[PDB]
């Protein structure tokens, strides 16, 4: 009913954004009921989802309707995907989504440079804890003019055509904001090397010059990235391709650096997950088990290095694994699998039963294009857990 | 919670919309839970209120800051009313107020000849059984140009330049609009009976062509009404200032003459509810029994004759109490008299403790200004009923 | 440049804005040269249609994007039409338009029954003299409700999904807005004669209650119409299918009762402007003469529309309408050309093909013909002889 | 009559922006024909001002009605200022101003932190040369989250509850927006020398980390600065309270620092215009003539802006800022004739007063100490000498 009742308390100011609640709300609140999220914060979280975020997702692609704007976060070119957070004992929901700006896609705003700043900006005087100056300092050092804009546009492909991208954890009562910048715009426009305007944007950071175990854990990742990525202008993979911020105080925010590939082995995920021997521990280790299992039991790979300040030892990053053109049906037996593995016997038992009752409109069974992403992740005190992306309107056909 | 959920959810577009809530939500909150609506319809209705009213409340007056324009549905100035419909077993909870234009009390609107309009406009996209043809009617019978609205302000109070006002009803899952009109600021202006104008913008309803009951009803009316009110342009009580309607299909609505009189006492009690002798069954006067008592148990006194379509029998009155001025503790305790006369042990019982609850930053033993209004009813298939008219902002500092 | 600095200074709030605006404003600004409207009321007209008209248009139909909502004002689909109105000595120019409301075609809102409402709205907080109490009145007697606009699109063609349309006069400094209301889609729901609640809908008017001319004038009409319209529920020509407004004082509008009809020839054309020989003055046939001057020099209906004031009880000629949608613009220029001579108007006759060409610069008028769409034609005792005519503007600038 | 003319087709959304265009607009536009602007130009920057200022200008505090908001900008409260810039030739002009938020001096916003960079943003969608990577740049370095923003407040006057302020010069055609950031609130709340954070905000410019010519200025500049502003967090005069930048290529920006001190006399104009010697050519001395004799020819502190562009190693004299609030605007207009004649600007000085008169009608400028509210003056090698004028149009309204 909540997703019902909005719509029937709120209603809609156009077309398109009660086209979006109607592919996107179901699934969002049957995602929370499935979470064990209480009923006062399903209303919370949808009563924001269509006051904030409707506005923001823009038009709604569909037969006869080609918007100017079309985004790469999804298959169907929708600025939205839904994903979760899997753990031991509990489930964290999450919104990721562009901000669709008025004049996205045409001469006025070609790479849609405002309107995640405008979101933003709003998600400030609603929450307190939100926090806008990482935002601004990497808009700053990766922001492009709009002549720079129009010329970024000739060299990528429509679906690639933006600078920033924004998330949304629906954590304990609260909506925790992040940030995601891309660099290969101004690498493309300035011929810069991508690794260069990653590291020089992050050496300008106010949080960079006070915190030297931060300024140290940079280097060990600078040393390990510089002989594995280009030192030219190429656009050639590996890539550090992805610039990522918590939208909170710049001294409690994780800064991301992430890496796009195409060719993934085990070698490499050894590699990648150790730093190049960097990491030889028992926990990166038993880290390690657990992705080489996950790939044994299976768009670019990711591979997201994440650092805090007041901390000087690098981590194992996170790695994403591209489910886009596998069958679905087939992913959610292999999740179930790893899921047993890991010894969550709960998670395993309910996945598939969940994930139709996600998308009911959809047999998983024949679907290619549900699962977009999947990320894991081992942490010391937390331990391990596994991100989901589903593309919801691609589930709701 | 669900006041705080929404608020926390949906923050506020500006400064006087926060403060509405501040002092709105948190009683309108409470009405619905001791009216035992479900959490659902609490989110329902907050959400609503939220989004569709707020705004429509314009600025909230207070030290510092003096609107253009002023209500006179409160003492404060707020055009807000909270009120309630009390049965013999159950309790509905209804909104009162007037729709503020961004432009209300200046020279391009004097009247605030929009607002409502347009909030009723909004509720028809949003509501499938929201009608605007009854409303469209008298509001080319009753409303004035901005020449015509300017003169009407130079012979009004303050309190008193509006055309219309509306009402929500939230019955069952519902909203129900009403809207009453002014026939005062016409008379006024064009210098014409108030009589005149009333039944003339009556007679030409579509549905009173088309519906001879009604037409006949009418006649009972005006026959009774002619020799009571002002037959010249006077504004000498009583007067038939106010007409009302229901916002959905005209042949369903309710169409309500209202009189307005400072004069009330046993033999006009008497000569209202019974039409002058017109009505003698034993239903007019057990009711009769009922408001006698009411008086006895204890701004305008106000007649209100209302009327539907296939129906050519006037039926009783209901009748409006003025308690502006009177201690509101008091009211408590005799509303407490009367529930038991009535035989209504249950709300006499729980009637003040819930006051209590309503406005708890008030002391009502000290206060004579939160009861504003108090109508009684009776009806032969729904049998009697009281609506008393709370003023929400007052009961809020 | 009028229309290139507001672009400038203004911007827009989004991209179909910008393309009404592309499409659009350009012909505006040099219909308002060529009529001969000073700098600063381009600018007024200018900024005016900027601000509220714009928004009003809705998305600008193109290829990849189709809208909800599909207008009859034009070709395209775009519900937009600017005209012009020709005299002797002077133009002047006005603005056709459907105010589209954002749910407009869908479940919550068919008939598209709010925008035209709402932008009038704005025009009352704009303008001191615009009234609105002929607009609800109307729109009371005429308009319905969801469940009733949904059966009404199940029998009309997505091209009139509409209850109103407005207009507005660009009249010496001034903004004149109009409505027009269709008697149709409340013929079809409720199974009613469309004269029958033609004249129910104007028989309850305030005003027609407090004037005995004006009630006597209509006699008149119907008395002619009667006979000459369905006295069934069909929507069989000739019909009354519009009803129209001027949106100020009640005792000083116009009333006006249109008639749509595929049929018309000579005999025709004289019943209609004399109302079958009720009009035998002289210059009700200096006007027959003038019309069918105008006929002889020449797929949409005909309409004729008869317009009556109050105070007056005496009828007089309508106006009526040619469709031109099908016929080229190339030939229409030459004969609208020879009927300005032939009305002694040399300037008008030495101007219109030029400056039509100079109106539309991105079509060739000799291979066009969609960009005349009506024109109507006019005989009054005191201004005297009055040429409408309504082009497609978005037809002109593709 | 463009003020008049736009206010005719526009009308407003809410009376707020009535009031503020109703004493506000008609000096502006009477400002901009005193400056030659043509016709088109007047429309354009109106209009523009009609569209994007007054919403931005928020409440109109007034008799009855306060704000939650204050603005330091102007004595009545207003957050607004028309300047101009005097030239030998030619004049252009300037609009200053705080673009208020509809929830700024409350809890959820308590400095303001975002009105101007959402006028910005309209900007950038509006005019093609609008930049917003130096603005996102000190906005990073001396914006605060909402708990600290409350905090500010707590130890500052209601007057200065703010970091960011916004111009834009009318200048050729075009609109080019600058803001100025204050370090004040950053140093209160960290307690941090102001002159530490003025730099370390600068130092991380990307700017600077490409330009070493730049980077030298800088060194300079602080040179000088560093014994002369507070070693400490205290807020003592003189101190580096603004950073201003142009919100265009960064590359083409100049950046500013400026002083605020309240003790000048005439060891001090030349120890801050030649940066303590360090300034000896004749440009530089003609200059100190010109500044010496303004001074000679005559509550707000003393303003001494450091502009400084990159690709420049070497800097140049600032511009100075001499308050006039609390001085007879009467006395002012002939102190400025004088120093007219004086530069052999003998037309600026034969119009001043008069057109001074001109600007703001509802006032006896003779009675007035508040309308005239800063004035700069600056010399520049190539552009020549310069004198900006700071209004008070609000002042000069009521
Ligand atoms: C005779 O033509 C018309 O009245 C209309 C509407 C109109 C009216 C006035 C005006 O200045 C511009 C357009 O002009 C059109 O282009 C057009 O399609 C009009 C119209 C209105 C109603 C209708 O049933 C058919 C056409
Ligand atoms: C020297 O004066 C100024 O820069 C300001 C801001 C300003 C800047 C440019 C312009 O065209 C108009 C106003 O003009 C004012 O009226 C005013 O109050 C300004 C201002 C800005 C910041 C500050 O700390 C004090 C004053
Ligand atoms: C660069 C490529 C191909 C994929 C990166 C995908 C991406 C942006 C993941 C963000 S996971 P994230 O939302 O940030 O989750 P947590 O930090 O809380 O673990
Ligand atoms: C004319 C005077 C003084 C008071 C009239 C008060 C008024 C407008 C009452 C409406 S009661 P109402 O909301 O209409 O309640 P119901 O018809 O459902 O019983
Ligand atoms: C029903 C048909 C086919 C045509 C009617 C066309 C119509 C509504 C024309 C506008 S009449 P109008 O613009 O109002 O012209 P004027 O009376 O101002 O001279
Ligand atoms: C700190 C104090 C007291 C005064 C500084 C005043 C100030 C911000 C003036 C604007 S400088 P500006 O308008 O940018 O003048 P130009 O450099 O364009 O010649």
Tied chains: 1, 2.
């Excluded at 849609?112 to 400030?124: H, I, P, Q, V, Y």
Aim: hydrophobic residues 40%.
């Amino acid at each position: 009913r909540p997703w019902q009742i909005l719509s029937q308390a709120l209603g809609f100011p156009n077309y398109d954004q009660e086209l979006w609640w109607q592919n996107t709300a179901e699934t969002l609140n049957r995602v929370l009921e499935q979470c064990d999220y209480s009923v006062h914060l399903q209303y919370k979280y949808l009563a924001f989802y269509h006051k904030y975020i409707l506005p923001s997702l823009g038009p709604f692609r569909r037969p006869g309707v080609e918007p100017e704007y079309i985004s790469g976060l999804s298959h169907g070119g929708h600025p939205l995907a839904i994903s979760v957070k899997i753990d031991k004992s509990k489930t964290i929901c999450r919104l990721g989504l562009q901000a669709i700006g008025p004049l996205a896609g045409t001469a006025r705003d070609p790479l849609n440079s405002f309107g995640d700043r405008e979101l933003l900006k709003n998600l400030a005087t609603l929450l307190p804890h939100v926090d806008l100056r990482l935002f601004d300092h990497f808009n700053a050092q990766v922001g492009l003019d709009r002549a720079q804009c129009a010329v970024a546009t000739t060299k990528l492909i429509k679906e690639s055509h933006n600078i920033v991208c924004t998330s949304l954890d629906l954590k304990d009562g609260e909506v925790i904001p992040k940030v995601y910048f891309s660099t290969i715009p101004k690498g493309l426009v300035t011929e810069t090397p991508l690794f260069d305007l990653t590291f020089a944007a992050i050496e300008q950071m106010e949080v960079y010059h006070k915190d030297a175990p931060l300024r140290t854990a940079l280097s060990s990742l600078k040393d390990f990235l510089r002989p594995r990525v280009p030192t030219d202008a190429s656009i050639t993979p590996p890539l550090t391709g992805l610039i990522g911020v918590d939208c909170i105080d710049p001294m409690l925010s994780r800064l991301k650096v992430y890496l796009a590939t195409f060719r993934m082995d085990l070698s490499l995920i050894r590699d990648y997950w150790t730093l190049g021997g960097l990491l030889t521990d028992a926990g990166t280790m038993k880290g390690l088990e657990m992705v080489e299992t996950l790939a044994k039991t299976l768009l670019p790979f990711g591979i997201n290095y994440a650092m805090k300040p007041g901390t000087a030892e690098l981590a194992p990053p996170q790695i994403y694994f591209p489910l886009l053109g596998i069958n679905d049906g087939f992913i959610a037996d292999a999740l179930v699998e790893f899921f047993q593995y890991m010894g969550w016997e709960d998670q395993a038992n309910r996945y598939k039963d969940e994930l139709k009752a996600k998308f009911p409109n959809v047999d998983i069974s024949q679907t290619k294009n549900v699962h977009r992403w999947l990320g894991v992740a081992y942490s010391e005190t937390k331990g391990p857990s596994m991100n989901i992306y589903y593309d919801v309107v691609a589930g709701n056909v």
